[PDB]
């Protein structure tokens, strides 16, 4: 995936948007743009609204102003996105016809958007029912432990907070089981107990509102007496079957910054494809996502796993506003990865060929995710602005059918 | 102009929950949407959760917070936060986190040309009269409204209004200063995230 990032950062055309005017600057030193046309497209939440093509005629180190025709003023809600791509119409010795050599995306105008579930309480769980949908929250764990559509269970593993990732080579550095490197991210995480932290239930309560049921939970993650993380959640299940999850996390200032702040569950279903409105199509992370474009992407599940020979956290897509998998839809503003391999398996397997697809599908939905680094892979390389150091984090999801 | 989208109340087991949603609009465009929850529990504490959406295409707002005019005028302001002096997100390195206690007058900086002033950042507790606010916020507290400051050319023309204006911000824009004839607020101090969340607890 990184290659695409390189391609984007090294591209020979730079773009600047001013109103509806695109300034295309050539970083070629010698050649005129004699085999380039600029395709542009305006889209609303992934739906195209207008497009066009303009031949590039820009001298080396020169500028070309391209005036866009009046773009649409869709009175519907959502964010307009302008995407430009430079296409080489004719083949070269090194490229086929239609080769994409450069691209850029900007946000245009945004228009902001302007039966009651029955609760049954037992000593062991809260059960919420609405039509053929059923949610089961375990009161001893404090987590959404099962979901039914009709009679079919949807979860193999409860929906739980996740603050760790299968370490990247950049997280490990030169640290080895025999020769620990204490400044490596993985060693700091392990020493702080991030991978061994035991969730402790502080609160689990249910309450029926006028048109919804509200489940409020609070957990503390602890290691050797120290509280690393506190998660306080609210689950609001309303008369439309939509489960709105609000998550507020506190992170101890003195514990190493966590790799991620999100949720994970093992979904019982395995679907052939993953659809999402977000950055894609390829794997992208907070400090490697410039090359990714915001759009409606639809890929086979296999393409959501990057087969790094040394397994690690992989396949994240950021800036995601909608995720569709099977009958499930998640909405919000999150990063996600979706695969057949748990973070645990990735972490404890040395070679990709030794991975075995687990039952169902592991979904990691993150409100926040740490950078991956890469300035070097033998010292901490994640820049401060990509570390999860804020101490308090908030994210909201909506899970529905 | 604030437009009410939602205002609903609901009694929980041990608290009352008021949920509201407002849209700020100008000439047909929605600039901001605020969605709040007020949870008043059996201890008298009012927990306020605020989630704000800001249109990507509107200029980044100077602040995202709350304001009210308190009826009381107290002699002193106590706070656990950055101080003792005025500090802003791009000017707070010199401020120290501590328990500070100053006369109310010292919470107003008398710039000859009136403007936003007196902000204290990184504040976890604020005590004024019988009121206590808790969370992680920036605040200023004075006898002068933002409107009066904006519409008055000289400090000597300011008149203390009835009571005390409290501005509690979850977020506040930088002040700049590289120059004062062009935009100087660096990107990392502009409120550009599009979505903001902050929580307060107001009690006696």
DSSP B20-41: EEEEEEETTEEEEEEEEEEEEE
Q: Which residues contact A396 (CB under 8 A, 6 or more apart)?
A: A244, A245, A246, A247, A332, B51
The two structure tokens encoding residue A178: 């025999």
Rg from Cα positions in chain A: 24
| CB count in 10 Å sphere of residue A234 | 17
Which DSSP category does B161 fall into? P
* Nearest Cα to Cα of residue B66 among B190, B166, B193, B201: B166
The secondary element (H helix, E strand) that includes residue B166 is strand B164-172
Q: What single-letter DSSP state applies at residue B146? A: H
Cβ atoms B116, B95 nearer than 8 A: no
Contact A112 B33 (CB under 8 A): yes
Contact A336, A276 (CB under 8 A): yes
Q: Are A348 and A332 in contact (CB under 8 A)?
A: no
Q: Decide if A308 contacts A341 (C-beta within 8 A).
A: no
Let me know: does A209 contact B10? Beta carbons within 8 Å.
yes
d(C-alpha A43, C-alpha A78), whole Å: 10
Which DSSP symbol is given to B151?
Answer: H
- For B204, the 3-state DSSP assignment is coil
Q: How far is B100 from chain A (nearest CA, A)?
A: 22
Rounded to whole angstroms, the Cα distance separating A222 from A192 reads: 10
Largest interatomic CA distance in chain A: 76
SS3 content of chain B, % helix, strand, coil (to 5): 10, 55, 40
Q: Do B10 and A108 touch (CB under 8 A)?
A: no
Q: Are strands B46-54 and B195-203 parallel, antiparallel or unpaired?
A: antiparallel
Secondary structure class of B193 (helix, strand, coil): coil
Q: Which of A19, A45, A112, A206 to mutate to test the interface with B (most CBs of B within 10 A)?
A: A112
Cα–Cα nearest to A341, from A285, A264, A286: A264
The candidate with the shortest Cα–Cα distance to A40, out of A23, A57, A56, A52, is A52
Please list, in sequence order, all residues whose beta carbon lies within 8 angstroms of the beta carbon of residue B191, skipping any fewer than 6 positions away. Answer: B54, B60, B61, B62, B63, B64, B171, B172, B173
Number of C-alpha atoms within 13 angstroms, CB side, residue B170?
22
Q: Confirm if B175 and B185 have CB atoms less than 8 A apart.
A: yes
Q: How far apart are CA A79 and CA A106, in angstroms?
A: 10
Residue of B13, B30, B57 lying closest to A205 (CB–CB) = B13
Helical H segments across chain B, by residue range: 146-151
> Which residues partner with B142 through β-bridges?
B165
Distance of CA B135 to the CA centre of its chain: 12
Contact residues for A139 (Cβ-Cβ < 8 A; gap 6+) = A122, A123, A124, A125, A126, A204
Chain B contact for A398 (CB, 8 A cutoff): no
Residue list, annotated binding site of A: 378
The count of C-alpha atoms lying within 13 angstroms of the C-alpha of A390, restricted to the half-sphere facing its C-beta, is 18
B chain contacts of residue A207, beta-carbon cutoff 8 Å: 12-13
Question: What are the structure tokens assigned to B203, written together?
Answer: 């009690």
Domain assignments of chain B as residue spans, ordered by start: 1-204
Token pair for residue B22? 């407002």
d(CA A205, CA A190) in angstroms, rounded, equals: 32
If you compute the radius of gyration of chain B from its CA atoms, what whole number of angstroms results?
Answer: 18
Q: Torsion angle, CA of A401/A107/B55/B120, rounded to 10 degrees?
A: 110
- Which two tokens mark A101? 């050599």
Please answer whether residues A125 and A138 qualify as being in contact, where contact means their C-beta atoms are separated by less than 8 angstroms.
yes
Way it was determined: cryo-EM
What span, in angstroms and rounded, lies between the C-alpha atoms of A308 and A160? 26
A396 vs B contacts (CB less than 8 Å): 51
Distance of alpha carbon A383 from alpha carbon A370, whole angstroms: 10
| Beta carbons of A380 and A371 less than 8 angstroms apart | no
Spatial separation of the C-alpha atoms in residues B30 and A77, rounded to whole Å: 11
Three-state DSSP at B162 gives coil
Q: This structure's resolution (angstroms)?
A: 1.8
Ramachandran category for residue B129: left, alpha or beta (phi over 0 → left; psi -120 to 50 → alpha):
left
Q: Nearest-CA neighbor of B90 among B167, B17, B174?
A: B174
Q: Which residues of A are annotated as a binding site for substrate?
A: 378
- Both tokens of A112, joined, read 């902001």
Nearest to B5 among A107, A114, A396 (CB): A114
Tokens representing A350? 């040395």
The phi, psi pair for B159, rounded to 5°, reads -125, 130
DSSP state of B186: -
Query: How far is A197 from A228, CA to CA, in rounded Å?
Result: 8
- Partners of A236 in the beta sheet? A214, A244
**CA A307 – CA A351 distance, rounded (Å):** 10
Using a CB–CB cutoff of 8 Å, tell me whether A384 touches chain B: no
Nearest to B32 by CA among B185, B190, B196, B183: B196
Neighbours of B134 (CB within 10 A): 18
- The string over A360-370, giving b where at least 16 C-beta atoms fall within 10 Å of a residue's C-beta and e elsewhere, is bbbbbbbbbbb
Specify whether the CB–CB gap between A314 and A306 falls below 8 A.
yes
Structure tokens at B81: 């936060």
Residue A281: asked if its preceding bond is cis (omega within 30°), the reply is: yes
Q: For residue B53, give the 3-state DSSP assignment.
A: strand
| CB contact burial A267-296 (16+ within 10 A = b; e otherwise) | bbbebeebebbbbbbbbbbbbbbebbbbbb
Task: Check whether B181 is labelled as a binding-site residue.
Answer: yes
Q: Among B121, B156, B159, B157, which Cα is nearest to B140's?
A: B121
**Chain B residue numbers touching A333 (CB-CB < 8 A):** 195
Q: Which residues pair with A85 in a beta bridge?
A: A39, A103
Nearest to residue A377, comparing CAs of A312, A318, A316, A317?
A312
Encoded tokens for A388: 């999860």
Q: Do B199 and A79 touch (CB under 8 A)?
A: no
**How far apart are alpha carbons A199 and A222 in whole angstroms?**
7
Kind plus residue range of the DSSP H or E element containing B123: strand B120-128
Chain-centre distance of CA A321, in angstroms? 9
SS (H, E, C) chain A: CHHHHHHHHCCCEEEEEECCEEEEEECCCCCCCCCCEEEEEEEECCEEEEEEEEECCCCCCCEEEEECCCCCCCCCCEEEEEEEEEEECCCECCECCCEEEEEEEEEEEEECCCCCCEEEECCCEEEEEECCEEEEEECCCCCEEEEEECCEECEEEEEEEECCCCCCHHHHCCCCCCCCCCCCHHHHHHHHCCCCCEEEEEEEEEEECCCEEEEEEEEEEEECCEEEEEEEEEEEEECCCCEEEEEEEEECCCCCCCCEEEEEEEECCCCCEEEEEEEECCCCECCECCCCEEEEEEEEHHHHCCCCCCCCCCCCEEEEEEEEECCEEEEEEEEEEEECCCHHHHHHCCCHHHCCCCCCEEEEEEEEECCCCCCCCCCCCCCHHHCCCCCEEEEEEEEEC
Distance of CA A239 to the CA centre of its chain: 28
The first and second tokens of residue A277, run together, are 């409105």
Neighbours of A51 (CB within 10 A): 11
């Amino acid at each position: 995936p990184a290659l695409t990032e390189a391609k984007h950062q090294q591209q020979f055309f730079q773009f600047r948007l001013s109103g509806q005017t695109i300034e295309v600057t050539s970083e070629y030193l010698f050649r005129h743009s004699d085999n380039e046309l600029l395709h542009w497209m305006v889209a609303l939440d992934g739906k195209p609204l207008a497009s066009g093509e303009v031949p590039l005629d820009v001298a080396p180190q020169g500028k070309q102003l391209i005036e866009l025709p009046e773009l649409p003023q869709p009175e519907s809600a959502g964010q307009l996105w302008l995407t430009v791509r430079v296409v080489q119409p004719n083949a070269t010795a090194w490229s086929e016809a239609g080769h994409i050599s450069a691209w850029q995306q900007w946000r245009l105008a945004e228009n902001l958007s302007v039966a009651i579930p029955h609760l049954t309480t037992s000593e062991m769980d809260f059960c919420i029912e609405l039509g053929n949908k059923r949610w089961q929250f375990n009161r001893q764990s404090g987590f959404l432990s099962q979901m039914w559509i009709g009679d079919k269970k949807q979860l193999l593993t409860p929906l739980r907070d996740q603050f760790t990732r299968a370490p990247l080579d950049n997280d490990i550095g030169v640290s080895e089981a025999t020769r620990i490197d204490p400044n490596a991210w993985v060693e700091r995480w392990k020493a702080a107990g991030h991978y061994q932290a035991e969730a402790a239930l502080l609160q689990c309560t249910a309450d029926t509102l006028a048109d919804a049921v509200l489940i409020t939970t609070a957990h503390a993650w602890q290691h050797q007496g120290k509280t690393l993380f506190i998660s306080r959640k609210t689950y609001r299940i309303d008369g439309s079957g939509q489960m709105a999850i609000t998550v507020d996390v506190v992170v101890a200032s003195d514990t190493p910054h966590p790799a991620r702040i999100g949720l994970n569950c093992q979904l019982a279903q395995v679907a052939e494809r993953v659809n999402w409105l977000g950055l894609g199509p390829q794997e992208n992370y907070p400090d490697r996502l410039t090359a990714a474009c915001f759009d409606r992407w639809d890929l086979p599940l296999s393409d959501m796993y990057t087969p790094y020979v040394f397994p690690s956290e992989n396949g994240l897509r950021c800036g995601t506003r909608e995720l569709n998998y099977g009958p499930h839809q998640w909405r919000g503003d999150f990063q996600f990865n979706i695969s057949r391999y748990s973070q645990q398996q990735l972490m404890e397997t040395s070679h990709r060929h030794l991975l075995h697809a687990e039952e169902g599908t592991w979904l990691n939905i993150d409100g926040f995710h740490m950078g991956i680094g890469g300035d070097d892979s033998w010292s901490p390389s994640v820049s401060a602005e990509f570390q999860l150091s804020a101490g308090r984090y908030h994210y909201q999801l909506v899970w529905c059918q």
